[PDB]
Amino acid sequence: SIKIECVLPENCRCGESPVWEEVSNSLLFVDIPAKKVCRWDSFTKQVQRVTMDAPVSSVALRQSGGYVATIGTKFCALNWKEQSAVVLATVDNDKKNNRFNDGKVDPAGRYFAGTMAEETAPAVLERHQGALYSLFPDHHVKKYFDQVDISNGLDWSLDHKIFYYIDSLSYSVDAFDYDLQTGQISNRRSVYKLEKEEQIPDGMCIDAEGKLWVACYNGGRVIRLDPVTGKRLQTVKLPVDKTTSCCFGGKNYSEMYVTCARDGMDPEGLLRQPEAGGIFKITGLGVKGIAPYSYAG
Amino acid sequence: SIKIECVLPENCRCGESPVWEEVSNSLLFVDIPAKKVCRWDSFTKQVQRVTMDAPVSSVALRQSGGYVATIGTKFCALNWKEQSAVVLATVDNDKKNNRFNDGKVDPAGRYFAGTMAEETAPAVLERHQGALYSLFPDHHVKKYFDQVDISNGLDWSLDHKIFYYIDSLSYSVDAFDYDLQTGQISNRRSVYKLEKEEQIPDGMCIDAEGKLWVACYNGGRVIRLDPVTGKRLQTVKLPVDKTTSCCFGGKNYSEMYVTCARDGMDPEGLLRQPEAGGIFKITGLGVKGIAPYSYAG
Ligand SMILES: [Ca+2]
Ligand SMILES: [Ca+2]
């Protein structure tokens, strides 16, 4: 009764950062090395595309209007209709081949995003070169920690007391105590270690029951995790191997949207997986998610 | 089957640089932060140790008599007999806290050794402060490259046309084309990426079939690698996690000796592995190694 369909065969090089915009019933997402932000209207089925001058690794809603995005190593505000971005802040000013990777807005409107060294591939990048940052509403940037290999999926518990975080090459989903008032995190611990067949943990979202959904890059699946009991609750396999991230959207957040990547596939894979890089929608899971937060600056 | 024996429960802070001295049937090794160069007589089972005035990170045979060693950031001649060091050359004169790490003599009698920033935890240190050097027979020094994190295992193919090399924080074994006659290296490429469970690649030696054995720090193992296919051929697990290096020794190089470290172990861990820091001997691998080369200067 679980239905998986490709709703948009966008053939992304590396589709990422799905975000649901409930005021327009649209899905935003990026295609990182194509430098591309996309917005798909789920009612008209139309997609709009904008291309930036550097890799675009995440996008988020901005409450005052437009969007925010991580472009290269810069936090930026985007005016969609003017096709214009303004730089809010720049990070990793000493590295000279880094980029932002995954990012998401916290329950107080702060845009968290982490970095990584750029890659010729998974493990193939300079190691431990990233850091986790957050852009506060007053446009100050906080640096939380470094030594990150690949900053990836992240989300917050429903009572806004825990921050969940993936550094991919740790193969671990971690938790921190989190203070909603100051944005401060502490007491890092692992909540879940992936199995071999689950491959590399990539993007992540929480659901309305407090469970975590993690996209498994090269594992062709999302997994549902109980961060309190530490147990995997479910596996949902997709028709593509390079599953990168996931969010809930649609009617009452009852649908899951999954991004994936076409880069790195050989001909043979591409036959077999002709919708690689598409946007997939999973219905019938019997769980709902929650709305995303919007940047407050 | 293989057989593993702790032949010397030496409890080294950080045992390293194992070298077999067949002319005395002894294993040479260092304990880096204890500042000691050690000889273990495999017949009487007794150990000699000489204390230097700075961390001693590698030792090698010197054809003309005695040993050469890397002490702090100095290449030194060691008169065993007087327990005196003569500086042959120094490197990293500009650095706030570097030391040599692993070193080994090449097939023409040149002393290769590289550096790193000193640690404050494993493996945690100022990034990219090291370089790979070689000490030539007339005591001049060649600098091959910098931006090294932790210079660390190395060896040469049996046809003397390839040099293999680990910078630990690359989690990779690299190969270079190597010219016996000039000591020059070129065309760097990775030949093997460690898997997550293999942790940090540390020391490395070649066997008589041209395959590489790599000690996996915190992985409690040595792995056998095929540098031509990139395939891992074998895993041998040890009773301790902090395996640091390995060499062949014993009669016709038919036994493997493995060093390890006690530093950074929890009281806990020690308790689970009381021989941490010991010297282990592995028999039954079914392949032999080759003799160490001797410094020609
Ligand atoms: Ca990702
Ligand atoms: Ca070492």
Coordinates of C-alpha atoms and ligand atoms in Angstrom, one line a residue:
Chain A
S1 CA 0.0 0.0 0.0
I2 CA 3.1 2.1 0.0
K3 CA 3.3 3.8 -3.4
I4 CA 6.6 5.2 -4.8
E5 CA 6.4 7.4 -7.9
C6 CA 8.6 9.7 -9.8
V7 CA 6.7 13.0 -9.9
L8 CA 9.4 14.9 -11.7
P9 CA 12.1 13.2 -13.9
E10 CA 14.5 16.1 -13.5
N11 CA 17.6 14.0 -14.0
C12 CA 19.4 15.9 -11.3
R13 CA 23.2 15.5 -11.2
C14 CA 22.8 15.6 -7.4
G15 CA 19.3 16.5 -6.3
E16 CA 19.2 17.7 -2.7
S17 CA 17.6 19.8 0.1
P18 CA 13.9 19.1 -0.5
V19 CA 11.7 21.7 1.3
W20 CA 7.9 21.9 1.3
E21 CA 6.4 25.4 0.9
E22 CA 2.9 24.9 2.2
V23 CA 1.6 28.4 1.4
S24 CA 2.0 27.4 -2.3
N25 CA 1.9 23.6 -2.2
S26 CA 5.4 23.6 -3.8
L27 CA 8.5 21.7 -3.3
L28 CA 11.9 23.5 -3.5
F29 CA 15.1 21.5 -4.1
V30 CA 18.6 22.0 -5.4
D31 CA 20.9 20.3 -7.9
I32 CA 24.3 21.0 -6.3
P33 CA 26.9 20.7 -9.1
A34 CA 24.4 22.1 -11.7
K35 CA 24.2 25.2 -9.5
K36 CA 20.5 25.0 -9.7
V37 CA 17.5 25.8 -7.4
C38 CA 14.2 24.4 -8.4
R39 CA 10.6 25.0 -7.4
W40 CA 7.9 22.6 -8.4
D41 CA 4.2 23.5 -8.0
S42 CA 2.4 20.3 -6.9
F43 CA -0.9 21.5 -8.4
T44 CA 0.1 22.9 -11.8
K45 CA 3.1 20.4 -12.0
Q46 CA 5.2 23.3 -13.3
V47 CA 8.9 23.7 -12.4
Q48 CA 10.9 26.9 -12.3
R49 CA 14.7 26.8 -12.3
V50 CA 17.4 29.3 -11.4
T51 CA 21.1 28.9 -11.8
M52 CA 23.8 30.4 -9.6
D53 CA 27.5 31.1 -10.1
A54 CA 28.7 28.4 -7.7
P55 CA 27.3 25.1 -6.3
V56 CA 24.0 25.5 -4.4
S57 CA 23.8 23.0 -1.7
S58 CA 20.6 23.9 0.3
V59 CA 17.6 26.2 0.1
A60 CA 15.2 27.4 2.8
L61 CA 12.2 29.6 3.3
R62 CA 12.7 33.2 4.5
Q63 CA 9.8 34.5 6.5
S64 CA 10.1 38.1 5.2
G65 CA 10.0 36.9 1.6
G66 CA 12.0 34.9 -0.9
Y67 CA 14.4 32.3 0.0
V68 CA 17.8 31.8 1.6
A69 CA 20.4 29.4 0.2
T70 CA 23.9 28.2 0.6
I71 CA 25.9 29.1 -2.5
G72 CA 29.6 28.1 -2.5
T73 CA 30.6 29.1 1.1
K74 CA 28.1 31.9 1.3
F75 CA 24.8 32.3 3.0
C76 CA 22.6 34.2 0.6
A77 CA 19.2 35.6 0.2
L78 CA 17.4 34.9 -3.1
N79 CA 14.8 37.0 -4.9
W80 CA 13.3 34.3 -7.2
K81 CA 11.6 36.6 -9.7
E82 CA 14.5 39.0 -9.9
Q83 CA 17.0 36.1 -10.2
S84 CA 19.2 37.9 -7.8
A85 CA 21.0 36.8 -4.7
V86 CA 22.5 39.0 -1.9
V87 CA 25.3 37.6 0.2
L88 CA 24.5 37.6 3.9
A89 CA 27.7 36.0 5.2
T90 CA 30.7 34.0 4.0
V91 CA 32.3 31.1 5.9
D92 CA 35.4 29.0 5.6
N93 CA 37.3 32.0 4.5
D94 CA 40.7 30.1 5.1
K95 CA 39.9 27.0 3.1
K96 CA 40.3 27.3 -0.3
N97 CA 38.3 24.4 -1.9
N98 CA 35.3 24.0 0.5
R99 CA 31.6 24.3 0.0
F100 CA 28.5 24.3 2.1
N101 CA 26.6 21.0 2.0
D102 CA 23.3 20.3 3.9
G103 CA 21.5 23.0 5.8
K104 CA 18.1 23.6 7.5
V105 CA 16.5 26.3 9.6
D106 CA 16.1 25.7 13.3
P107 CA 12.9 26.3 15.4
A108 CA 14.0 29.8 16.2
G109 CA 14.6 30.9 12.6
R110 CA 18.4 30.3 12.5
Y111 CA 19.9 28.9 9.3
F112 CA 22.2 26.0 10.2
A113 CA 24.5 24.8 7.5
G114 CA 27.8 22.8 7.5
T115 CA 30.6 22.6 5.1
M116 CA 33.0 20.1 3.5
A117 CA 36.0 20.0 1.2
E118 CA 34.8 19.7 -2.4
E119 CA 34.9 16.2 -3.9
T120 CA 36.1 14.0 -6.9
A121 CA 34.3 11.6 -4.7
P122 CA 32.6 10.1 -1.3
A123 CA 35.7 9.5 0.9
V124 CA 37.5 11.2 -1.9
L125 CA 37.9 14.7 -0.7
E126 CA 40.3 16.3 1.8
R127 CA 39.0 14.9 5.1
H128 CA 37.8 16.7 8.2
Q129 CA 37.8 20.0 6.5
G130 CA 34.2 21.2 7.3
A131 CA 32.5 22.9 10.1
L132 CA 28.9 23.4 11.3
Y133 CA 27.7 27.0 11.2
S134 CA 24.5 28.9 11.8
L135 CA 23.3 32.2 10.5
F136 CA 21.4 34.0 13.2
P137 CA 18.4 36.3 12.5
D138 CA 20.6 39.4 13.0
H139 CA 23.0 38.0 10.4
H140 CA 25.8 37.0 12.9
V141 CA 27.3 33.6 12.1
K142 CA 28.2 31.1 14.8
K143 CA 30.7 28.4 14.3
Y144 CA 29.8 25.3 16.4
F145 CA 32.6 22.8 15.7
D146 CA 35.0 21.7 13.1
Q147 CA 36.6 18.6 12.0
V148 CA 33.6 17.6 10.0
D149 CA 34.1 15.3 7.0
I150 CA 30.8 15.8 5.1
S151 CA 28.2 17.9 6.9
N152 CA 24.9 16.3 6.1
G153 CA 21.3 15.7 7.3
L154 CA 20.0 17.5 10.4
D155 CA 16.8 18.3 12.2
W156 CA 15.4 19.2 15.7
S157 CA 13.2 17.2 18.1
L158 CA 9.6 18.3 18.4
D159 CA 10.0 19.8 21.8
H160 CA 13.0 21.8 20.6
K161 CA 15.4 20.4 23.1
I162 CA 17.5 18.1 20.9
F163 CA 19.5 18.7 17.6
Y164 CA 20.1 15.6 15.4
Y165 CA 23.1 15.7 13.0
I166 CA 24.9 13.5 10.4
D167 CA 28.5 13.7 9.5
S168 CA 28.3 11.2 6.7
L169 CA 31.6 9.4 7.0
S170 CA 31.0 8.8 10.7
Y171 CA 28.2 6.4 9.6
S172 CA 26.4 7.7 12.7
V173 CA 23.3 9.8 13.4
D174 CA 24.2 12.0 16.4
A175 CA 22.2 13.9 19.0
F176 CA 23.0 17.1 20.9
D177 CA 21.2 18.8 23.7
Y178 CA 19.9 22.0 22.2
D179 CA 18.8 25.4 23.7
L180 CA 16.0 27.1 21.7
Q181 CA 16.7 30.4 23.1
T182 CA 20.5 30.7 22.4
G183 CA 21.1 28.1 19.6
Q184 CA 23.7 26.4 21.7
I185 CA 24.3 22.7 21.5
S186 CA 26.2 20.3 23.7
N187 CA 26.8 16.7 24.8
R188 CA 27.2 15.1 21.4
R189 CA 26.2 11.3 21.4
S190 CA 25.5 8.7 18.8
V191 CA 21.9 7.6 18.5
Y192 CA 22.2 5.2 15.6
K193 CA 25.0 3.5 13.7
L194 CA 24.2 2.5 10.1
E195 CA 24.3 -1.2 9.1
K196 CA 26.6 -2.0 6.0
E197 CA 23.8 -2.4 3.7
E198 CA 22.5 1.0 4.7
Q199 CA 25.6 2.6 3.1
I200 CA 26.2 6.3 3.6
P201 CA 23.8 8.3 5.8
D202 CA 22.9 11.5 3.9
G203 CA 19.9 13.8 4.4
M204 CA 17.4 13.5 7.3
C205 CA 14.1 14.7 8.5
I206 CA 12.0 14.2 11.6
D207 CA 8.4 13.1 11.6
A208 CA 5.4 14.1 13.7
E209 CA 6.0 11.1 16.0
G210 CA 9.6 12.2 16.7
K211 CA 11.1 9.6 14.5
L212 CA 14.0 10.3 12.1
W213 CA 14.0 9.4 8.4
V214 CA 17.5 9.1 6.9
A215 CA 18.3 8.9 3.2
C216 CA 21.0 6.3 2.5
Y217 CA 23.3 7.3 -0.4
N218 CA 24.0 4.2 -2.5
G219 CA 21.6 2.2 -0.4
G220 CA 18.5 3.0 -2.5
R221 CA 16.4 3.6 0.6
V222 CA 15.1 5.8 3.4
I223 CA 15.3 4.3 6.9
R224 CA 13.1 5.3 9.9
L225 CA 14.9 5.5 13.2
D226 CA 13.7 5.8 16.8
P227 CA 16.3 8.2 18.3
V228 CA 15.2 7.3 21.9
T229 CA 15.3 3.5 21.6
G230 CA 18.1 3.5 19.0
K231 CA 16.3 1.1 16.8
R232 CA 15.6 1.1 13.1
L233 CA 11.8 1.0 12.8
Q234 CA 11.4 0.6 9.0
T235 CA 13.1 0.5 5.6
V236 CA 11.5 1.9 2.4
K237 CA 13.5 0.9 -0.7
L238 CA 13.4 3.2 -3.8
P239 CA 14.0 2.3 -7.4
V240 CA 17.2 4.4 -7.5
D241 CA 20.5 3.7 -5.5
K242 CA 21.7 7.3 -5.0
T243 CA 19.0 8.5 -2.6
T244 CA 20.3 11.7 -1.0
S245 CA 17.6 13.4 1.1
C246 CA 14.0 13.5 2.1
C247 CA 11.3 15.7 3.6
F248 CA 7.5 15.5 4.2
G249 CA 5.1 17.5 2.2
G250 CA 1.8 17.4 0.4
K251 CA -1.6 17.2 2.1
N252 CA -1.1 17.3 5.9
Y253 CA 2.6 16.4 5.4
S254 CA 1.5 12.9 4.7
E255 CA 3.7 12.5 1.6
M256 CA 7.4 12.0 1.6
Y257 CA 9.6 13.6 -1.1
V258 CA 13.0 12.0 -1.9
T259 CA 15.8 13.4 -3.9
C260 CA 18.6 11.5 -5.6
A261 CA 21.6 11.8 -7.8
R262 CA 22.5 10.7 -11.4
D263 CA 26.2 11.6 -11.2
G264 CA 28.5 8.7 -10.6
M265 CA 26.3 6.2 -12.4
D266 CA 27.5 4.0 -15.1
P267 CA 25.5 3.2 -18.3
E268 CA 24.4 0.1 -17.0
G269 CA 23.0 1.6 -13.8
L270 CA 21.2 4.3 -15.8
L271 CA 19.5 1.6 -17.8
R272 CA 17.8 -0.1 -14.8
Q273 CA 17.3 3.2 -13.1
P274 CA 16.2 5.5 -15.8
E275 CA 14.7 8.0 -13.3
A276 CA 17.9 8.5 -11.4
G277 CA 18.1 12.1 -10.3
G278 CA 14.3 12.4 -10.2
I279 CA 12.0 13.6 -7.5
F280 CA 10.2 10.7 -5.9
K281 CA 7.0 10.8 -3.8
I282 CA 6.2 8.1 -1.3
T283 CA 2.6 7.7 -0.2
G284 CA 0.8 5.4 2.2
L285 CA 3.5 5.2 5.0
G286 CA 0.9 6.0 7.7
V287 CA 3.1 8.7 9.2
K288 CA 3.1 12.4 8.8
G289 CA 5.9 15.0 9.1
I290 CA 6.0 18.6 10.2
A291 CA 6.3 21.9 8.6
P292 CA 9.8 23.4 8.0
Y293 CA 11.0 26.4 9.8
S294 CA 11.6 29.7 8.0
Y295 CA 14.7 31.9 8.3
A296 CA 13.9 34.8 10.7
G297 CA 16.4 37.4 9.3
Chain B
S1 CA 45.4 -20.8 10.8
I2 CA 47.5 -17.9 12.1
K3 CA 49.1 -17.8 15.6
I4 CA 49.5 -14.5 17.5
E5 CA 51.9 -14.2 20.5
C6 CA 52.7 -11.2 22.6
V7 CA 56.4 -11.9 22.6
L8 CA 57.2 -8.8 24.7
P9 CA 54.6 -7.2 26.9
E10 CA 56.5 -4.0 26.9
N11 CA 53.5 -1.7 27.5
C12 CA 54.9 1.0 25.1
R13 CA 53.3 4.4 25.2
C14 CA 53.6 4.3 21.5
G15 CA 55.6 1.5 20.1
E16 CA 56.7 2.1 16.5
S17 CA 59.2 1.6 13.7
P18 CA 59.7 -2.1 14.0
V19 CA 62.9 -3.2 12.1
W20 CA 64.3 -6.8 12.1
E21 CA 68.1 -7.0 12.6
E22 CA 68.9 -10.5 11.3
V23 CA 72.6 -10.2 12.1
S24 CA 71.7 -10.3 15.8
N25 CA 68.2 -12.0 15.5
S26 CA 66.7 -8.9 17.2
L27 CA 63.8 -6.6 16.7
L28 CA 64.6 -2.8 16.8
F29 CA 61.7 -0.5 17.6
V30 CA 61.0 2.9 19.2
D31 CA 58.7 4.1 22.0
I32 CA 58.1 7.6 20.6
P33 CA 57.1 9.8 23.6
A34 CA 59.3 7.8 26.0
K35 CA 62.2 8.9 23.8
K36 CA 63.5 5.4 23.5
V37 CA 65.2 3.3 20.9
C38 CA 64.8 -0.4 21.9
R39 CA 66.3 -3.9 20.8
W40 CA 64.7 -7.1 21.7
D41 CA 66.8 -10.2 21.5
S42 CA 64.6 -13.0 20.1
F43 CA 66.8 -15.7 21.7
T44 CA 67.3 -14.4 25.2
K45 CA 64.0 -12.5 25.2
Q46 CA 65.7 -9.5 26.8
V47 CA 65.4 -5.9 25.8
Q48 CA 68.0 -3.0 25.7
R49 CA 66.8 0.6 25.6
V50 CA 68.6 3.8 25.0
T51 CA 67.0 7.1 26.0
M52 CA 67.3 10.1 23.7
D53 CA 66.7 13.8 24.4
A54 CA 63.6 14.3 22.3
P55 CA 60.8 12.0 20.9
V56 CA 62.3 9.3 18.7
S57 CA 60.0 8.4 15.9
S58 CA 61.9 6.0 13.7
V59 CA 65.1 4.0 13.6
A60 CA 66.9 2.3 10.7
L61 CA 70.1 0.3 10.1
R62 CA 73.2 2.2 9.1
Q63 CA 75.5 0.2 6.9
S64 CA 78.7 1.7 8.4
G65 CA 77.7 0.7 11.9
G66 CA 75.1 1.6 14.5
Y67 CA 71.8 3.2 13.6
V68 CA 70.2 6.2 12.1
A69 CA 67.1 7.7 13.7
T70 CA 64.7 10.6 13.5
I71 CA 64.7 12.5 16.8
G72 CA 62.5 15.6 17.0
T73 CA 62.9 17.1 13.6
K74 CA 66.5 15.9 13.2
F75 CA 68.0 13.1 11.2
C76 CA 70.6 11.6 13.5
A77 CA 73.3 9.0 13.6
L78 CA 73.0 6.9 16.7
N79 CA 76.1 5.3 18.3
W80 CA 74.4 2.5 20.2
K81 CA 77.5 1.6 22.0
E82 CA 78.1 5.3 23.5
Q83 CA 74.4 6.3 23.5
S84 CA 75.2 9.5 21.6
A85 CA 73.5 11.1 18.7
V86 CA 75.1 13.1 15.9
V87 CA 72.9 15.4 13.9
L88 CA 73.2 14.7 10.2
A89 CA 70.5 17.2 9.0
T90 CA 67.5 19.1 10.3
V91 CA 64.1 19.9 8.8
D92 CA 61.0 22.1 9.6
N93 CA 63.1 24.8 11.2
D94 CA 60.1 27.1 10.8
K95 CA 57.7 24.9 12.8
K96 CA 55.6 25.7 16.6
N97 CA 55.9 22.1 17.3
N98 CA 56.6 19.5 14.6
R99 CA 58.3 16.1 14.8
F100 CA 59.3 13.4 12.4
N101 CA 57.0 10.4 12.3
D102 CA 57.5 7.3 10.2
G103 CA 60.6 6.7 8.2
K104 CA 62.3 3.9 6.3
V105 CA 65.4 3.3 4.1
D106 CA 64.8 3.0 0.4
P107 CA 66.4 0.4 -1.9
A108 CA 69.4 2.7 -2.6
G109 CA 70.1 3.4 1.1
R110 CA 68.4 6.8 1.3
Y111 CA 66.5 7.6 4.6
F112 CA 62.9 8.6 3.8
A113 CA 61.0 10.2 6.7
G114 CA 58.2 12.7 7.0
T115 CA 56.9 15.0 9.6
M116 CA 53.7 16.1 11.3
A117 CA 52.5 18.6 13.9
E118 CA 52.8 17.1 17.5
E119 CA 49.7 15.9 18.8
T120 CA 47.5 16.8 21.8
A121 CA 45.2 13.9 21.2
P122 CA 44.9 11.1 18.7
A123 CA 44.9 11.9 16.0
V124 CA 44.4 15.7 16.7
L125 CA 46.9 18.1 15.7
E126 CA 47.4 21.2 13.6
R127 CA 46.5 20.3 10.1
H128 CA 48.8 20.0 7.1
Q129 CA 52.0 21.0 8.9
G130 CA 54.2 18.1 7.7
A131 CA 56.3 17.2 4.7
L132 CA 58.0 14.1 3.3
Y133 CA 61.8 14.2 3.2
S134 CA 64.7 11.9 2.3
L135 CA 68.2 12.0 3.6
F136 CA 70.8 11.1 1.0
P137 CA 74.0 9.3 1.6
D138 CA 76.0 12.5 1.7
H139 CA 73.6 14.0 4.1
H140 CA 71.7 16.4 1.9
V141 CA 68.0 16.4 2.3
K142 CA 65.3 16.4 -0.4
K143 CA 61.9 17.7 0.2
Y144 CA 59.3 15.9 -1.9
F145 CA 56.1 17.6 -0.9
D146 CA 54.3 19.4 2.0
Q147 CA 50.8 19.8 3.2
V148 CA 51.1 16.4 5.0
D149 CA 48.8 15.8 8.0
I150 CA 50.5 12.8 9.5
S151 CA 53.4 11.3 7.6
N152 CA 53.2 8.0 8.2
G153 CA 53.7 4.1 6.6
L154 CA 55.9 3.7 3.5
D155 CA 57.7 1.1 1.4
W156 CA 58.9 0.2 -2.1
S157 CA 57.8 -2.3 -4.7
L158 CA 60.1 -5.3 -5.3
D159 CA 61.1 -4.1 -8.8
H160 CA 62.1 -0.7 -7.2
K161 CA 59.8 1.2 -9.5
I162 CA 57.0 2.2 -7.1
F163 CA 56.9 4.0 -3.8
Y164 CA 54.0 3.5 -1.5
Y165 CA 53.0 6.0 1.1
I166 CA 50.4 6.8 3.8
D167 CA 49.4 10.2 5.0
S168 CA 47.1 9.0 7.7
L169 CA 44.4 11.6 7.5
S170 CA 43.9 10.9 3.8
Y171 CA 42.7 7.3 4.9
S172 CA 44.4 6.2 1.7
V173 CA 47.5 4.2 0.6
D174 CA 49.1 6.1 -2.2
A175 CA 51.6 5.0 -4.9
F176 CA 54.2 7.1 -6.8
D177 CA 56.4 6.2 -9.7
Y178 CA 59.9 5.9 -8.2
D179 CA 63.3 6.2 -9.7
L180 CA 66.0 4.1 -8.0
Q181 CA 68.8 6.0 -9.4
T182 CA 67.8 9.5 -8.4
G183 CA 65.4 9.0 -5.5
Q184 CA 62.7 10.9 -7.4
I185 CA 59.0 10.2 -7.1
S186 CA 56.1 11.2 -9.3
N187 CA 52.5 10.7 -10.5
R188 CA 50.9 10.3 -7.1
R189 CA 47.7 8.2 -7.1
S190 CA 45.6 6.3 -4.5
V191 CA 45.8 2.6 -4.6
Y192 CA 43.5 1.7 -1.7
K193 CA 40.8 3.7 0.5
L194 CA 40.3 2.3 3.9
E195 CA 36.8 1.3 5.0
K196 CA 35.3 2.8 8.1
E197 CA 36.1 -0.2 10.3
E198 CA 39.7 -0.1 9.3
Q199 CA 40.0 3.3 11.0
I200 CA 43.3 5.2 10.6
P201 CA 46.1 3.7 8.3
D202 CA 49.4 3.8 10.2
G203 CA 52.5 1.8 9.4
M204 CA 53.0 -0.3 6.3
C205 CA 55.4 -2.9 4.9
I206 CA 55.6 -4.9 1.6
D207 CA 55.7 -8.7 1.4
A208 CA 57.7 -10.9 -1.0
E209 CA 54.7 -11.2 -3.3
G210 CA 54.5 -7.4 -3.7
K211 CA 51.4 -7.0 -1.5
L212 CA 51.2 -4.4 1.2
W213 CA 50.4 -4.9 4.9
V214 CA 49.0 -1.9 6.7
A215 CA 48.5 -1.5 10.5
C216 CA 45.1 0.1 11.3
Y217 CA 45.3 2.4 14.3
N218 CA 42.2 1.9 16.4
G219 CA 41.2 -0.9 14.0
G220 CA 43.0 -3.7 15.9
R221 CA 44.2 -5.3 12.7
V222 CA 46.7 -5.5 9.9
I223 CA 45.3 -5.6 6.4
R224 CA 46.9 -7.1 3.3
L225 CA 46.4 -5.1 0.1
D226 CA 46.9 -5.6 -3.6
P227 CA 48.1 -2.3 -4.9
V228 CA 47.4 -3.3 -8.5
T229 CA 43.7 -4.0 -8.0
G230 CA 43.0 -2.0 -4.9
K231 CA 41.6 -5.2 -3.4
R232 CA 41.9 -6.0 0.3
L233 CA 43.3 -9.6 0.3
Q234 CA 43.2 -10.4 4.0
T235 CA 42.5 -9.1 7.4
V236 CA 44.3 -10.3 10.5
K237 CA 42.8 -9.0 13.7
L238 CA 45.0 -8.5 16.9
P239 CA 44.0 -8.6 20.6
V240 CA 44.6 -4.8 20.9
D241 CA 42.9 -1.8 19.1
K242 CA 45.9 0.6 18.7
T243 CA 48.0 -1.4 16.3
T244 CA 50.6 1.0 14.9
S245 CA 53.0 -0.6 12.6
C246 CA 54.3 -3.9 11.3
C247 CA 57.4 -5.5 9.6
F248 CA 58.6 -9.0 8.8
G249 CA 61.3 -10.7 10.7
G250 CA 62.4 -14.1 12.1
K251 CA 64.1 -16.7 10.0
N252 CA 64.0 -15.6 6.3
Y253 CA 61.5 -12.9 7.2
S254 CA 58.8 -15.5 7.8
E255 CA 57.2 -13.9 10.8
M256 CA 55.4 -10.6 11.2
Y257 CA 56.0 -8.3 14.1
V258 CA 53.3 -5.7 15.1
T259 CA 53.8 -2.7 17.4
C260 CA 51.0 -0.9 19.2
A261 CA 50.3 1.8 21.6
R262 CA 49.0 2.2 25.2
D263 CA 48.6 5.9 25.0
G264 CA 45.1 7.1 24.9
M265 CA 43.6 3.9 26.2
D266 CA 40.7 4.1 29.0
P267 CA 41.4 2.4 32.0
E268 CA 38.6 0.2 30.8
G269 CA 40.2 -0.5 27.6
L270 CA 43.3 -1.7 29.5
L271 CA 41.6 -3.9 31.4
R272 CA 40.1 -5.5 28.3
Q273 CA 43.5 -5.5 26.7
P274 CA 46.2 -5.7 29.2
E275 CA 49.0 -6.2 26.6
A276 CA 48.3 -2.9 24.9
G277 CA 51.7 -1.4 23.9
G278 CA 53.2 -4.8 23.4
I279 CA 55.1 -6.4 20.6
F280 CA 53.1 -9.1 18.8
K281 CA 54.4 -11.8 16.6
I282 CA 52.2 -13.4 13.9
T283 CA 53.1 -16.8 12.4
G284 CA 51.3 -18.7 9.7
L285 CA 50.6 -15.8 7.3
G286 CA 51.9 -18.0 4.5
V287 CA 54.0 -15.3 2.9
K288 CA 57.4 -13.9 3.8
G289 CA 58.7 -10.3 3.8
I290 CA 61.9 -8.8 2.7
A291 CA 64.9 -7.5 4.6
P292 CA 65.2 -3.8 5.5
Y293 CA 67.6 -1.7 3.5
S294 CA 70.5 0.0 5.3
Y295 CA 71.3 3.7 5.3
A296 CA 74.3 4.4 3.1
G297 CA 75.5 7.6 4.8
Ligands
CA1 CA 23.2 15.5 1.5
CA2 CA 53.1 5.3 12.6

